[PDB]
Amino acid sequence: AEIRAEQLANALRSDSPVFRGEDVPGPVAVLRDNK
Amino acid sequence: VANPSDSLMTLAEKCHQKWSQTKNPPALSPYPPFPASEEAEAILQRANLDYDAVVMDTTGEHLRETTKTLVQYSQDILNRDSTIQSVLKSLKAHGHVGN
Amino acid sequence: QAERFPVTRDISLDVKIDQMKAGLTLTRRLPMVYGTAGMASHGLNGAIRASVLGVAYPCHPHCVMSLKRSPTLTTEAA
Amino acid sequence: QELRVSRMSLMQSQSDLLEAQKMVEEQRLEIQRLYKVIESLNREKSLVPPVVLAPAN
Amino acid sequence: QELRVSRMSLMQSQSDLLEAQKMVEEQRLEIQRLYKVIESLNREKSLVPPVVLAP
Amino acid sequence: QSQSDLLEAQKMVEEQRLEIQRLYKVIESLNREKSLVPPVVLAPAN
Amino acid sequence: QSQSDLLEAQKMVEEQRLEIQRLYKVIESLNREKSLVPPVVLA
Known part of the structure; x- marks a missing residue:
């Protein structure tokens, strides 16, 4: 989806209707003393 | 070179004169919308104006005239800086004479 | 016709606020066909009243005789 | 001595209480x-005659 | 003689007092x-005729 | 979780609006105050 | 569908921001001063 959205974003480029930026954070957990 | 006194005196006199002639930057205008079309037609209706009439906004004209005048005021600020540096050099010379 | 064409509504609508400021309440007056008459409303002393209060005597806001406000009529009459 | 404390407290609270009803009806x-x-000034917020001006030339 | 006011209850006299003083603050x-x-409408420059510029 | 947001953001847009x-x-207040003139409209013909 | 309106909501509040x-x-630049000028230029 990221390569697809990028390669057809250049078609406009050659006031976008999207938000593009960051998100509202949720849960990310990490391994307990593993990595 | 006779009386640095009188010379610096005339210098500071010119100073006072120009220095004090204040100049006020162009004023700001009603935030664009004003008088707000919706309300303009109401005014153009409670007037009982015989000839049918429309509301021709001019906001743009006022705004670009303000641009021009602000450009002129910036040119004035530049002239002021230059004159200040000139008076500084004149003071340097009169000060050598005074030492 | 005596209702929306009254005798006097004072110099401005600011003085109605000023009468409330350090004063009393307002006045409601209703239509009257007859009995709004007398001295000092539209007799010749009302002209002295008009010069003092600041307003116009005959037909208090204006001297209206036409039906529509005509800017082209005022320019040709100037 | 707590009796006369309640003597002065009830006289002052009752005087302030009848003060309150006369004052509330005064602000009423x-x-x-x-x-x-309010109901006056909003009514002829539409009947004021707007002025119109024209150039001399 | 003990007065009529003195034999009244302290709780009811204060509770009506704070309720009534609350009503004073409601009105203020x-x-x-x-x-x-009123002050905004006077200072509004809405109590003046708006201007129209006919040719 | 994707419904807790769109209920945080929907209140967010509603109260900002x-x-x-x-x-x-x-602005519609402070513009008509603090100006010398009443609101100026221009009325030419068609 | 829930994120269809959520991307709309985040863009709507970001341009509102x-x-x-x-x-x-x-609001505060209109303070800064004593009186303003008319917008009319005529001519």
């Missing part, structure tokens, strides 16, 4: 006076 | 809102 |  |  008349001003 | 903050819209 | 309408009344 | 920042200049 000022409520009615300004409500007449 | 209403004079706040009413005189704020 | 009421604040925007407040600003379009207090 | 930039737009209200612009009006936050305008």
Whole structure:
């Protein structure tokens, strides 16, 4: 989806209707003393 | 070179004169919308104006005239800086004479 | 016709606020066909009243005789 | 000695209480006076004649 | 003789006092809102005729 | 989780929109005050 | 569908955030001064 959205974003480029930026954070957990 | 006194005196006199002639930057205008079309037609209706009439906004004209005048005021600020540096050099010379 | 064409509504609508400021309440007056008459409303002393209060005597806001406000009529009459 | 404390407390609280009802009904008349001003000034917020000006030339 | 006022209850006299003083504050903050819209309407420059520029 | 957001963001846009309408009344206030002239309209013909 | 309206909501509040920042200049820049000028130029 990221390569697809990028390669057809250049078609406009050659006031976008999207938000593009960051998100509202949720849960990310990490391994307990593993990595 | 006779009386640095009188010379610096005339210098500071010119100073006072120009220095004090204040100049006020162009004023700001009603935030664009004003008088707000919706309300303009109401005014153009409670007037009982015989000839049918429309509301021709001019906001743009006022705004670009303000641009021009602000450009002129910036040119004035530049002239002021230059004159200040000139008076500084004149003071340097009169000060050598005074030492 | 005596209702929306009254005798006097004072110099401005600011003085109605000023009468409330350090004063009393307002006045409601209703239509009257007859009995709004007398001295000092539209007799010749009302002209002295008009010069003092600041307003116009005959037909208090204006001297209206036409039906529509005509800017082209005022320019040709100037 | 706590009896005369309640003596002065009830006399002062009752005097302040009858003070309160006469004062509330006094501000009630000022409520009615300004409500007449509100319903008046908004009514002819549409009947004022707008002025119109024309150039001399 | 013990007075009529003295034999009254301390709780009921105070509870009516704080309720009534609350009603005084209800009305004062209403004079706040009413005189704020009188003062704003006077200072509005809405009590003046708007101007039209005909040719 | 994707419904907790769109219920945080929907309140977020709703209360900001009421604040925007407040600003379009207090700009609409401070513009008619503090100017020498009543609102000026231009009325030419067709 | 839930994120269809959520991307719409985040864009709607982000442009509102930039737009209200612009009006936050305008409320206090109108203080700054004594009186303004008419917008009419005529001519």
